Subunit: 325 residues, 2 copies
């Protein structure tokens, strides 16, 4: 009997592991890996990974002049340390997220992505194995647009809650999008569901159908799963990134998972072509009319920014230990 | 038997009437008047003002080619018709709101403001008597910045919920800001007059302006009740709905000065800057969940009132075409 995990892969979905705990992911045989500020913070606290934090702290000490510069450099190196280790375990790519504090700064986001890519190159990792992960604000989408076409740097568009964001991303020729399933459902829940009626599931289906109808090459990676019913409803979608607990539930089970989403079927549901990438006021207005997406994007940026500030303090403490000892 | 309303004026606050019902406002002897989408919709539904709506519809029918253009032109004329009548009643200014659907479009907001001013000029109204009301997005603030310095067009910055927006507005040299008192309190409630977060926010803004010598007028807006009002007595201006004005007109309850520039100066925080740094403004505003969510919803709400006015005008335009 085939595990639920293998059945998902057979249904046509690539499995992606959402964790910084790279030691824990290999048994699920994921294709790619994703990290984000919450996951990096969590992993950075684990005593077993102390040597990677130490290496990052030494790096930051070397390159910064002010303690602030030292700390910020070290935080960059932490992302790359974990990413490099992950790439030893997965055959595909790792997603490394641009500082969320830069979500409203296109120029700074482009420069940060270029810097992260350079650090990977210095570590012997080619840019083809990296997805630079960027919040799906107007500025983030435009940053990705530049990185993809000007630099050949592949981007993963995250904190994506709306069809409006997804259209803009497709037009920007981004490599991959990560529409959030669970957080969409969270909003309308407060204002639970069956999988067929789940607003997050319906949103991702709409985005998928559109991409496939109009022939956009951008990969769709469903993200932020709350339960296996959401997952089962989207089986067949290009990629899913999943937390370790849900991977373990799929791994241990033989419960059936069959194809639900496929390009040939979904094409017929795709809505008529629209456009946003060239009209900033129109994008901002239409996005603003989506209360859920506006509020969840805004909150996601604050949450990830708080996780980065927590990482900063963790690094400050270690940097001090290094200086003293 | 000095009314509460009169004591408010004596406390140093200019009283502004928040209403499109211009026949109802003279009783309170307001200095200025404010209108917005919600109020314009409400007054347009009143039968005593049918002749002004008819005039606006006739105007739209003349200038538009498509029905859409006719309706949109009529909407502009409705705003200007009411504003023109208000200016016969009040000695001071009228606030007329730029299409909230343009809140994220600096260029279109500037052009719309220029158009409204031209329409007022056509009606014989001098531009110094008009305040162009603009939502306090980054785009709106930059639009106001241009209107003030390039065109000498005076702006009233609305949907203002944060110190961040207030700083940018002062640096942009805007004529007036309208910080919302009640909606700020609404968020955090979901308080005494001294602990009311709306009151504290407005006091923070007022103190900052006065300490640093910014000439921008502070008009506290969006009151729920008299407790918030009394805590802010002495502030430059308050815009008040007819129900609150009536309450104050009929009441004898005491109102004394609480806010003045000389006392407030001492509470003002250190000078900061936002007007020249778009990413910084956007990041810091986004860190203020209340302000972000209230600005966002305020734009949706005013956009909904414009769509409702559109449908009212559409129906009249059809009646005019048919009959």
């Amino acid at each position: 009997a085939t595990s639920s995990l293998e059945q998902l892969k057979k249904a046509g979905t690539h499995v992606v592991a959402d964790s910084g705990d790279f030691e824990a992911i290999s048994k699920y045989e994921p294709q790619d890996s994703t990290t984000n500020p919450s996951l990096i913070l969590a992993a950075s606290k684990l005593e077993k990974y102390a040597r990677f934090i130490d290496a990052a702290v030494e790096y930051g000490r070397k390159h910064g002049k002010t303690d602030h510069e030292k700390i910020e450099n070290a935080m960059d190196k932490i992302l790359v340390e974990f990413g490099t280790q992950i790439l030893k375990v997965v055959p595909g790519r790792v997603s490394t997220e641009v500082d969320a504090r830069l979500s409203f700064d296109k120029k700074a986001t482009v420069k940060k992505a270029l810097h992260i890519i350079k650090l990977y190159k210095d570590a012997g990792v080619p840019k083809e194995r990296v997805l630079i992960k960027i919040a799906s604000t107007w500025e983030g989408i435009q940053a990705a647009r530049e990185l993809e076409v000007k630099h050949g740097i592949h981007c993963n568009m995250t904190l994506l809650f709306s069809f409006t964001q997804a259209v803009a991303c497709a037009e920007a020729n981004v490599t991959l999008i990560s529409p959030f399933v669970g957080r969409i459902m969270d909003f309308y829940k407060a204002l639970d569901y069956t999988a067929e009626t789940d607003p997050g599931v319906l949103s991702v289906k709409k985005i998928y159908s559109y991409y496939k109808r109009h022939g956009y090459a951008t990969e769709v990676m469903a993200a932020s799963f709350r339960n296996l019913d959401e997952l089962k409803a989207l089986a067949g979608i290009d990629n899913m990134t999943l937390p370790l607990n849900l991977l373990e539930q799929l791994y241990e089970s033989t419960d059936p998972i069959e194809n639900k989403l496929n390009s040939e079927s979904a094409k017929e549901e795709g809505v008529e072509k629209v456009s946003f990438i060239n009209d900033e006021p129109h994008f901002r207005y239409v996005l603003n009319e989506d209360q859920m997406a506006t509020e969840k994007l805004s909150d996601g940026i604050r949450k990830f920014s708080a996780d980065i500030e927590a990482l900063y303090k963790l690094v400050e403490e270690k940097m001090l230990e290094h200086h003293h000892h």
